[PDB]
Design a protein around this ligand. Structure first.
Ligand SMILES: [Cl-]
Ligand SMILES: [Cl-]
Length: 162
């Protein structure tokens, strides 16, 4: 298990534009296209992301390519952020994957709300951090995925994912 397999399990793969759990147009491996309500505004963004006229459909290769760029950007965003960096640097390899997952799902700005949990993770207070993480819209909206990420932070293993 690694960060790619992990995120591929949590987001799935769809080759045609779909709407995510929040109702936004997405495609591929959890690649958000836009928050507007317009399917046309989403086809245009897709087109622009792929470099071709897609008509809302892409191939497995194109989805994987966006996925590769999105993980890379998630990691780079963590490393550039003054609040996230130190947490990431303090974590072991498994737990780093867990933080990346959260950033890929919710963006550096969604993660902003986790001030308290991040401090607990930095301190290595696993159980406490797990409790605190769970008191969040995140956890209430996508409980199953939240449980898997949380357990990964609590345990430091990929058990939630075998
Ligand atoms: Cl893009
Ligand atoms: Cl879920």
């Amino acid at each position: 298990m690694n960060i790619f397999e992990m995120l591929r399990i949590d987001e799935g793969l769809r080759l045609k534009i779909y709407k995510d759990t929040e109702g936004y147009y997405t495609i591929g491996i959890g690649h958000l296209l836009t928050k507007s309500p317009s399917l046309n505004a989403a086809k245009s963004e897709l087109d622009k992301a792929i470099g071709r006229n897609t008509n809302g459909v892409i191939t497995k290769d194109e989805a994987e390519k966006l996925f590769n760029q999105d993980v890379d950007a998630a990691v780079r965003g963590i490393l550039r952020n003054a609040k996230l960096k130190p947490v990431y640097d303090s974590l072991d390899a498994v737990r780093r994957a867990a933080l990346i997952n959260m950033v890929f799902q919710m963006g550096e700005t969604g993660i902003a709300g986790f001030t308290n949990s991040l401090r607990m993770l930095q301190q290595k207070r696993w159980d406490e951090a797990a409790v605190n993480l769970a008191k969040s819209r995140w956890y209430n909206q996508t409980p199953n995925r939240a449980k898997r990420v949380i357990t990964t932070f609590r345990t430091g293993t990929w058990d939630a994912y075998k």
